[PDB]
């Protein structure tokens, strides 16, 4: 019932060194990898016990073939991109497709390509058109905007199938995805400086702050990033730094619960 999201990402790499696969594609529900394909295995496979257990061998067989297809297409598009740009070394092409389901039930959808980690092509499903960065992209958008059926399939998948799949996966992985693990919140000290630190919580979306003697908010608050602890939980911290003439307090919010702490 919180904002969730489905995303499938493709990555192609020309002239890759011994290790790097020429093509990798990966599926994700809110940062939980669910599916995987690469150029060595040439196989789509589950990246979660709950995906594996709940989909017949056909889904994987069927989508493996579809991804073998994309492999091939990216290999080719890469060479054409080189030929047009007069390129030379290992380059990257990438595509991201996906949808988001908000808590309020409304939806978003996204489809984008990138050459060398920079926006190349952005799809717009309300106007059935691509937007391109330079003529190279424009030229390849032109051909694409010719095929009307492809334009429409995308709108559909994004607006309809992507969500249907999200909903399924959410259910399929309920125990791990729709779970709530609250944080350990603590305060440590260290010019004298204090740190509100929280760890071992899920989901990762968390909000933290400091309130001046409960009244206002400290303007000057260094925020630690929210990082993965290793086990499926996340950890994060927030710091601030005159004999403390006004005693301070930490205010945190996770999964609907506003938490507070004094010193």
């Amino acid at each position, epitope marked *: 019932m919180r904002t969730h999201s489905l995303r499938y990402f493709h990555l192609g790499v020309s002239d890759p060194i011994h290790g790097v696969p020429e093509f990798i594609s990966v599926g994700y529900v809110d940062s939980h990898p669910i599916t995987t394909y690469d150029s060595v295995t040439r196989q789509k496979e589950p990246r979660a016990p709950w995906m594996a257990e709940n989909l017949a061998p056909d889904h994987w067989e*069927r989508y493996t073939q579809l991804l073998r*297809g994309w492999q091939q297409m990216f290999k*080719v598009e890469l060479k054409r991109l080189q030929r047009h740009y007069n390129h030379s070394g290992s380059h990257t092409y990438q595509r991201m497709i996906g949808c988001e389901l908000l808590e309020d039930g409304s939806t978003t959808g996204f489809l984008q390509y990138a050459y060398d980690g920079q926006d190349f092509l952005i799809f717009n499903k309300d106007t059935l058109s691509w937007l391109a960065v330079d003529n190279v992209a424009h030229t390849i958008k032109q051909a*694409w905007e010719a*095929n009307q059926h*492809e334009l429409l*399939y995308q709108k559909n998948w994004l607006e309809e199938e992507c969500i249907a799949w999200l909903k399924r996966f959410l259910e399929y992985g309920k125990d791990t995805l729709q779970r709530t693990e609250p944080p350990l919140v603590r305060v440590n000290r260290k010019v004298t400086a204090l740190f509100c630190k929280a760890h071992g919580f899920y989901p990762p979306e968390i909000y933290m702050t400091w309130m001046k003697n409960g009244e206002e908010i400290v303007q000057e608050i260094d925020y630690g990033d929210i990082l993965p602890s290793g086990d499926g939980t996340y950890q994060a911290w927030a710091s601030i730094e005159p004999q403390s003439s006004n005693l301070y307090s930490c205010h945190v919010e996770h999964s609907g619960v506003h938490m507070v702490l004094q010193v």
Partner: T-cell receptor
Amino acid sequence: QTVTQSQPEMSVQEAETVTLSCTYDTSESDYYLFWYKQPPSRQMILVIRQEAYKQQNATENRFSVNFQKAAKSFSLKISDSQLGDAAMYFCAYRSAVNARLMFGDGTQLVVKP
Amino acid sequence: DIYQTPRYLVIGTGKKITLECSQTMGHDKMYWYQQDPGMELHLIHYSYGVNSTEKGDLSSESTVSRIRTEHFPLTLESARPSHTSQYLCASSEARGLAEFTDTQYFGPGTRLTVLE
């Protein structure tokens, strides 16, 4: 993953409408539906195309379809039959993610003048 | 539109057969089906573009090659009676997605008969 055309043979008078009947079985939601005709030439010829994401039933002049999605029914309607219409007609389903065009067993249409 | 040679071929058992299929619509996706008397059409080979050659529902001792866009030949090394069937090449217009949002157009087919 399956198409059924139960009517092995079928007949129509010149200038009459006839309905060829077909059901498919699937679980996919994103899919593609076709009719093809195979005159004794043994050449497959596309008759019409319907996408599952469209309500309005396709119409190619004299040819049209009754797409009852929920019934998984896909009938070809031939108005104003002509002698030329004579051929084997085939119902076909294709997933948006697999290439095999799945074919019905085929209904042979004979036109009486 | 799309061409297929031969349209009829009678041949002895165990000889090398090459069915040609060519197309000039700029179609990257190409297909090969097989229709034995009665039995329904079976995708035996397909391709997403140049140097793609993938297998299909039915399993086959034929082989395909896709050195270039226009041609998708099918080869049969030791030809045997069971191979006797109608082989229909085909091609489709999807180019910007791997997915099959298109309509497949068939060529005229090759009536093969292999005899002992």
